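User: My advisor asked me to double-check a structure prediction for Factor VIIIa light chain before group meeting. I don't want to rely on an old file, so could you generate it fresh from this sequence?
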Amino acid sequence: NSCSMPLGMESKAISDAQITASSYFTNMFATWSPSKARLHLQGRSNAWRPQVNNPKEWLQVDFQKTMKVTGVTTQGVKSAATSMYVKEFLISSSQDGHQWTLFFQNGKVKVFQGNQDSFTPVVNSLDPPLLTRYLRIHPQSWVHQIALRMEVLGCEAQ
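Assistant: Sure, here is a fresh prediction for Factor VIIIa light chain from the sequence you gave:
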């Protein structure tokens, strides 16, 4: 129970450089960049959104070391009056950036059940816990548009 602390998305101990994505939506007034994918961030473009909405987009955190990951927390966003949130997602991970592993639950790729609105954070436990350096989230279903603010829960790999 001693390995459930936020690893730094909300606090910015995970720096902007550490968060990347397949793509992200940007125009003259908005940058829905990967580094906006931070739990409870407020503002005009306060979430990651991919450039196009499709099930092959992804958001990635690089912890810059191997960490013990025991949960992921996700949250949608509101763009003015429009609610946008991910309902279902997959996770993949890597210790070196070369070899990736899809997150399985007892022999089957786990489909995580995510958000049901644009504001409530949903915590998804990872059992078994992940010892990883890169963590990728793969949205599979969503309401209106893909949008993510997140936190990673865990501890150092000691």
